[PDB]
Amino acid sequence: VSLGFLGAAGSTMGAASMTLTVQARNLLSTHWGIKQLQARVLAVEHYLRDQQLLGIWGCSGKLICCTNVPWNSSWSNRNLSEIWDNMTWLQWDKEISNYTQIIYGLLEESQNQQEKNEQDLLAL
Amino acid sequence: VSLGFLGAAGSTMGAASMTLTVQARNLLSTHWGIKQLQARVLAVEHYLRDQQLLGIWGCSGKLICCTNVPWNSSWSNRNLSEIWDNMTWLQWDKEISNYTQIIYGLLEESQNQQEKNEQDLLALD
Amino acid sequence: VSLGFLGAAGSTMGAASMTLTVQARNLLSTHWGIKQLQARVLAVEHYLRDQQLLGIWGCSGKLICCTNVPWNSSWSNRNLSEIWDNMTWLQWDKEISNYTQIIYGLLEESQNQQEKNEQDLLALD
Amino acid sequence: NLWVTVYYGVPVWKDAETTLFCASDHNVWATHACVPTDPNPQEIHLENVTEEFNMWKNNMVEQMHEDIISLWDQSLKPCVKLTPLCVTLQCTNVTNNITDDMRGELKNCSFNMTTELRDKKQKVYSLFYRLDVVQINKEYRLINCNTSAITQACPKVSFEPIPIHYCAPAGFAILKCKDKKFNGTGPCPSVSTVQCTHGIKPVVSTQLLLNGSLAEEEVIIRSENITNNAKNILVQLNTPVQINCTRPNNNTVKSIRIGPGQAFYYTGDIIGDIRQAHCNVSKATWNETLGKVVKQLRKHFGNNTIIRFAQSSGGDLEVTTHSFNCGGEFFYCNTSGLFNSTWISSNDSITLPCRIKQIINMWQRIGQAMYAPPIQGVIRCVSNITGLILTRDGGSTNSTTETFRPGGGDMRDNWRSELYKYKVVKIEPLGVAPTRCKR
Amino acid sequence: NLWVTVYYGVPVWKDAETTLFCASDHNVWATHACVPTDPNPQEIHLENVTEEFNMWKNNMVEQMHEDIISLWDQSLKPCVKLTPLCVTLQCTNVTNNITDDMRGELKNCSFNMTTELRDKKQKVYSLFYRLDVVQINKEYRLINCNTSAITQACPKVSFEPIPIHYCAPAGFAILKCKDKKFNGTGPCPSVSTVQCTHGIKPVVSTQLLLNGSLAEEEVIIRSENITNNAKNILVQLNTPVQINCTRPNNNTVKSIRIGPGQAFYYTGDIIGDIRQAHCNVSKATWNETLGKVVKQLRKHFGNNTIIRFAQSSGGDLEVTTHSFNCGGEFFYCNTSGLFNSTWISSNDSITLPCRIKQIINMWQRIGQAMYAPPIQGVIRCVSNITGLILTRDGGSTNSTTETFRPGGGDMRDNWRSELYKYKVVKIEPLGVAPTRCKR
Amino acid sequence: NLWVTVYYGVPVWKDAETTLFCASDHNVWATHACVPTDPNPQEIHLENVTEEFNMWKNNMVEQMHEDIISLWDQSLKPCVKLTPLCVTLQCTNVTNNITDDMRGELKNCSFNMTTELRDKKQKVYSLFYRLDVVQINKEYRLINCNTSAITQACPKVSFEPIPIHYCAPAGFAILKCKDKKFNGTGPCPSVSTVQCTHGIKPVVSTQLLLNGSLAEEEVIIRSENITNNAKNILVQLNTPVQINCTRPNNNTVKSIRIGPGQAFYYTGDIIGDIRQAHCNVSKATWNETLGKVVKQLRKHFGNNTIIRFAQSSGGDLEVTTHSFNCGGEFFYCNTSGLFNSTWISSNDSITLPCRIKQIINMWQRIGQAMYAPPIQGVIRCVSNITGLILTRDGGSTNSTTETFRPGGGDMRDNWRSELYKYKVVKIEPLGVAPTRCKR
């Protein structure tokens, strides 16, 4: 059977990658009126910030997106068997949280260069 | 000339497929500020829920999107001439209302498998 | 050695085109509380209106989108070296301000025809 | 061998309830708080669309009702409280220059009122209309000093109805029924889509509906269930009947301070003699109007039945009598002169006597009273009767004679009368269908 | 030679504070302002997930505290103000039928009260409990006339706790610790995810926690720092102790108008004998309960340590007694009869005398006093003791005896007791990892 | 053979009007409900960008004005209503130790005030400053008892300005003009972009603007239309002029209860002799400052005209006199000693006598008065004059001499003085251009 909303937590990365639609579908799902509106607006704002990054990186329509940025062993030197089979996503997030900002900057730069190259090729 | 916002309602499904931008463009377009503010928030919320589904199904940038889910005759045992020329979208929606949850689940599954397959093919090089 | 949020303003169009992510990333970034809440909602609505247009024109996933609509000398009778090297985006916006609705209508029409043609080709295969 | 194709922007919808907002274009309805209107509003005809409407289950009515009450109350917040007026009054009759129709209608009351300084008192004389004053044992008190607080309405804020447009939020649409002679509950074969409703004036009245929409061709009779005598019947006229109302006495208005920046307005005196307020209905026009109404009623009750009209059955003045706001005064007019006839298979006027009342309790609430300041001078207004509210006088052992009486008091009926042609639906742009396209 | 791959919908989260909303399913919690609950609430088990919880740093407690106070205040806005009662009262002792449990507790007071008309006064007689009344020099005044306005609670609004469910907004989740015997601060090896908490009854009390959750197996001793004598100790029991409270005197309640629609309620008389309010706790049950508590305390304080209980140390009734709302009356019960034992390695009951007080200053605020109108008849309520709040007194160079006393009064402790198992986290769906896929 | 290419993230903008929000690093201006600031805010320089600024059409001024008034009113809601003070006062002159200049300035008043119990009164003696007390025939009343209620300002809330930063919402940006000697209406060749303005202190004054931002190099003279004598002229100085203000009398403050929970503060007595409040301006500095102002005024008025300064023309104290809040006290200083000279082609000082007033009516509103409670002790403050408001009075058609008088009273001018360098624009990231790229 299926797992519930965060039911994949605790499973390994290689298992959890197959439940991405489970988690994706729960995003967006007097005074007290104000309090409730703030809660709803906030959910939308967070959703959009993530979509914006996927847009910039060229992953706007995908749950799994492969890019052209190489992995740097300085961020992590673990082998694939260890990462995908003996770790959970929570553990992984902790391990590389210090390099997240760097990676994101690289993804933005790579996509921008790719768009320019496509524009030039289509002009031939 | 063009028709307005729901001008194609009542037209056949085929004919109405040509006005999709007309309808798409009108989505998102004391206390008396609470009602207005709630109204604005709600319009956004509904819009995003539909976009989320198109994203999941792999139709994120399209008005017309073809998928890999075959049509099951049990949902509606009709031929194309009848569906596209003798029916309106309102009639069609009523006819298959019960099966929309099934269809949506299948669309999500198909796209998820497709994404995994693409990832593997790219790695396999 | 980057420029800030509007740092490329005043540079030529061909230079400013290299900072599109700089500007894109800053979009979306007591009755005294409603003041603030309305501002948050408004920022979202504006963001989505622009996204809706990119969607219907078939440019949803990109900052630079090539289309199939030809440029009319009527809108601007200028050579490319003048436009891209001797003008800023602010100047350009003024020069073609009166034609933006025409252009937007054409972009919408072209994309609609394109989607239908893709659908037919797939059906034939 | 077909495949699923997803379409977005599909022209379909579902019945829905939502929040509608006010659009408009020194008033009770705070129209400055409403959205400016579109000078060229859209309406599109939908060919080959049949839609079910049900005016009796239309949530738009409920929402309009709540908005009117809330606006009403907000407009009384920044005003003078009249708490200091709940004192024993010493009252005698106003009999100097009166007609007999007014004998006992007005009273001359004196009392000890507060002043700007709390250690001073002033003697005030004022006139009251009797309906607002009750004996306690010459000793009287204002009628509501044992049930509610009184707020003086601000003299600068108009009670004249201003058209209000209800507008759908994005993602929603308002469908309108264009089928002439539509009665409100069946399928409507001819519809159109609009952005907002037409302007609706929030006119408040009982029995006779004023300044509304007219029927396109013939009198239309609508009810939730015509054979159920517990339901009201809303009759929409296809021609207006003109009614002319007046308060002929020349009132001199005085103003005093009762506190620190708090003024109280009252009738000081009357110039000329004292006569009753009244309304005039052209007699011939009224008789033609009833003939049209009776004809349409026969269609639901039977061949050669007898239809008779009678005055109201009794109960509170607010429902037994025709209430309305004319010139800013609140009138209570006796309609027994109109609804008194039997129908079986010149140019004079019908005069309806009216009472004026200053302490008002609207929307059938208890605990919140309003004092209507008197208005300087002489008042006249002319308005259109555009519809009637009737009730059936119980049932009978097949007597073959039906009796109708004026009804009202539930404000949702007035608004239902104007909003009967509108429906709110939610747009559902996403949908699927089979085709030959695979990917 | 690996490449970066982006994944969206990744099941990870991080600690966060946010705004939670109320779901619930006339009363002081304005439950009509809450949403319907999920009729089929989900809970999912997370295999192999270990999370750290810290009940003492749990923001949900602070937020619940603020919501309760705000709801409380809103319920008192549309009510009668009792400003006119700050008059000199002429008071004598009620000596008619005194059982000497209440000798001098009630006083028979009279005063000149306002009426519907501002120019008339009335003489009123009423009974008070000598907590609400303070001598000024037979001349008395109400106790709060020199600090606050007093508002009468509305007689139509219930004070009976209704379970409230807190729900996270989309993008957030609530993690629940299922580890039996969890003490609130360590890692929790067994967790589940919910969107809404279970319903929590907002019961307000001191010293003894009534109608809460029970420990799954054994008494649980929870504290921020057990060796710090400045901290409170919360004790969760694994079995309820039943307590039966009553106000045996049969009250006759009177009502007068004090102004224009302003009614005041008071006790007119007592029909039978005058007896003290009191609560009964089964003696055997109480003795077993303490034995269990002591055993668990030994685990922190030593197997040769003498554990003794004593009554509260002093201060206002709100902290020295066990306060609660029983049938709508406010009781202040003396618990020295419970906390009196030394522990070193039938069918009778303990009777706790109680006082009744009508003017209540809640949430330890100054400037906002509530008057609780009296309740007609005789009151009986039965409730469960589910936990205790204790403090450890003294200190020593070296000693063998520890002393515990009832404590609390800080309402956040009661809510902390019920919310100890919940944590709020933010979902962070976007992340990256290396793989062999390039493009 | 070019094609349309769509670009997103294009650095262009349009003039726009939006809602800006408060940001900021017990006080009248809320800080507790204002957004915490960025400790290191960014500013970017835009090379080759010229923008048109117009300080007189700047919506930011209107918006700031509304925010200041709303915050002001909000701070007075939870405070004492001094309704009971509108009584007849019995007053005599204070003659104990009076300098000749203050004979007639203080009055010793007594009255029967309410107390905690409503059936008692107390006799109170207090001192008033005459400007706020008016004779009613020795019988006086407070000046505003015939127009408004008085709210006592809360003694715990400071009136000291705290700088406020205005921030644009996402999608908007604030452009700033860095062109030194910019006059507010022309093109500005040197601009930068910020998200938030610098902090602006909401200092409230007439005639002389205190504690603002100084001109970078030279005195700058700005007006909407310099040749239109109906417009005000703002002068920004390039050097501060120091002004030392005092209220030398040593005030003893008393407090009484006027009702439950409500205390009233007043001056009981004065220790030492009575001398008037006054302000000291260095004389040499003032003469140099005017010389600079005149030199710049001349650029608009021939080269050789005579420029003279004169005192204010008349009208209410709020505009004829220099007002400010010093120590929380409200001063009205006479500036005729400053604006009295003719300019034709020593450690001294100028002493400006000042009056003190306790009943305040700000923002030129009628109907809402504030009572400024007295301050214990002696008050001294030092301020920086950073700018002037002048009126070029006299609709002269043939003259070689121009006359300038102090002006002001419309608060939007002070804020305009600080906000002159900012503009709000909307970012418009989407646009098109021809390229050679097709698809």
Ligand SMILES: *[C@@H]1O[C@H](CO)[C@@H](O[C@@H]2O[C@H](CO)[C@@H](O[C@@H]3O[C@H](CO[C@H]4O[C@H](CO)[C@@H](O)[C@H](O)[C@@H]4O)[C@@H](O)[C@H](O[C@H]4O[C@H](CO)[C@@H](O)[C@H](O)[C@@H]4O)[C@@H]3O)[C@H](O)[C@H]2NC(C)=O)[C@H](O)[C@H]1NC(C)=O
């Ligand atoms: C133009 O700008 C100047 C400079 O910013 C302003 O001048 C300041 O004005 C404020 C308000 O009057 C002054 O604040 C007060 O200072 C008193 C003295 O402070 C010194 O001595 C005490 C001794 O106990 C020390 O603790 C303190 O650190 C200083 O060394 C204080 O006694 C005052 O406190 C009382 O009032 C406040 C506010 O109501 C209460 O919260 C306190 O509890 C207490 O009752 C107060 O702090 C400030 O000192 C002035 N600065 C200077 C440099 O002189 C001008 O006012 C401004 N012009 C205009 C028109 O606004």
Ligand SMILES: *[C@@H]1O[C@H](CO)[C@@H](O[C@@H]2O[C@H](CO)[C@@H](O)[C@H](O)[C@H]2NC(C)=O)[C@H](O)[C@H]1NC(C)=O
């Ligand atoms: C939680 O941990 C257990 C192991 O303790 C995981 O279960 C194992 O899964 C592998 C792969 O399918 C099987 O080969 C093993 O036989 C399983 N072990 C046991 C004891 O059943 C489990 O998958 C982990 N995560 C979740 C979400 O359940």
Ligand SMILES: *[C@@H]1O[C@H](CO)[C@@H](O[C@@H]2O[C@H](CO)[C@@H](O)[C@H](O)[C@H]2NC(C)=O)[C@H](O)[C@H]1NC(C)=O
């Ligand atoms: C409403 O229905 C009628 C059919 O009853 C549609 O009329 C047909 O339109 C097509 C396209 O122009 C013509 O080729 C047919 O000859 C018409 N048939 C008849 C009987 O006239 C009409 O177009 C529909 N309206 C809408 C908006 O779709």
Ligand SMILES: *[C@@H]1O[C@H](CO)[C@@H](O[C@@H]2O[C@H](CO)[C@@H](O)[C@H](O)[C@H]2NC(C)=O)[C@H](O)[C@H]1NC(C)=O
């Ligand atoms: C502002 O304009 C100046 C030109 O007036 C730009 O500077 C030129 O840049 C080009 C390209 O690097 C050089 O070849 C020229 O020699 C430079 N000219 C001068 C005078 O320095 C400058 O880059 C523009 N600024 C922006 C933000 O676009």
Ligand SMILES: *[C@@H]1O[C@H](CO)[C@@H](O[C@@H]2O[C@H](CO)[C@@H](O)[C@H](O)[C@H]2NC(C)=O)[C@H](O)[C@H]1NC(C)=O
């Ligand atoms: C004031 O008016 C009242 C009301 O009309 C007069 O009282 C009525 O007197 C008639 C006899 O003439 C009785 O039949 C009615 O029953 C009385 N009605 C009421 C309500 O009392 C009253 O006499 C008039 N008083 C003066 C001084 O003119």
Ligand SMILES: *[C@@H]1O[C@H](CO)[C@@H](O[C@@H]2O[C@H](CO)[C@@H](O)[C@H](O)[C@H]2NC(C)=O)[C@H](O)[C@H]1NC(C)=O
């Ligand atoms: C207004 O108030 C005065 C008192 O200030 C009332 O006059 C007194 O009335 C009582 C009876 O209630 C008599 O015993 C006193 O002798 C009267 N005093 C004086 C000075 O005449 C007066 O009746 C009140 N008037 C109104 C219209 O309410």
Ligand SMILES: *[C@@H]1O[C@H](CO)[C@@H](O[C@@H]2O[C@H](CO)[C@@H](O)[C@H](O)[C@H]2NC(C)=O)[C@H](O)[C@H]1NC(C)=O
């Ligand atoms: C609750 O249980 C936790 C363990 O789950 C206790 O935490 C330990 O406390 C000791 C003493 O301070 C430390 O040396 C350990 O390192 C802590 N362990 C962990 C995992 O944090 C905690 O003291 C217990 N509290 C109570 C009141 O029983």
Ligand SMILES: *[C@@H]1O[C@H](CO)[C@@H](O[C@@H]2O[C@H](CO)[C@@H](O)[C@H](O)[C@H]2NC(C)=O)[C@H](O)[C@H]1NC(C)=O
């Ligand atoms: C109390 O103050 C008043 C107001 O200043 C004094 O009355 C004025 O006295 C001067 C002389 O100093 C006269 O020229 C004015 O004409 C008087 N004013 C009026 C309206 O008549 C009054 O004398 C002072 N009383 C005492 C005892 O000093």
Ligand SMILES: *[C@@H]1O[C@H](CO)[C@@H](O[C@@H]2O[C@H](CO)[C@@H](O)[C@H](O)[C@H]2NC(C)=O)[C@H](O)[C@H]1NC(C)=O
């Ligand atoms: C501020 O500077 C502007 C120039 O940027 C002055 O405006 C010009 O004034 C002359 C007067 O002879 C007009 O003919 C021009 O058409 C104006 N130009 C523009 C762009 O407005 C303005 O007068 C100066 N104002 C002050 C107070 O110094």
Ligand SMILES: *[C@@H]1O[C@H](CO)[C@@H](O[C@@H]2O[C@H](CO)[C@@H](O)[C@H](O)[C@H]2NC(C)=O)[C@H](O)[C@H]1NC(C)=O
């Ligand atoms: C600036 O102010 C001057 C006044 O000094 C305005 O000029 C006047 O305009 C009226 C109407 O056309 C003429 O009848 C007067 O003769 C003009 N006065 C002078 C001295 O020439 C001028 O119009 C204002 N500028 C703007 C833009 O409104």
Ligand SMILES: *[C@@H]1O[C@H](CO)[C@@H](O)[C@H](O)[C@H]1NC(C)=O
């Ligand atoms: C008799 O019945 C017919 C058919 O409904 C109707 O048209 C006609 O008007 C009726 N006649 C009378 C007198 O009601």
Ligand SMILES: *[C@@H]1O[C@H](CO)[C@@H](O)[C@H](O)[C@H]1NC(C)=O
């Ligand atoms: C009511 O007022 C009268 C005034 O004469 C006084 O004698 C009486 O004692 C007061 N009654 C009470 C209960 O205070």
Ligand SMILES: *[C@@H]1O[C@H](CO)[C@@H](O)[C@H](O)[C@H]1NC(C)=O
């Ligand atoms: C206080 O009231 C008494 C009542 O006898 C009056 O004589 C006295 O003048 C009043 N006092 C003041 C200061 O007004």
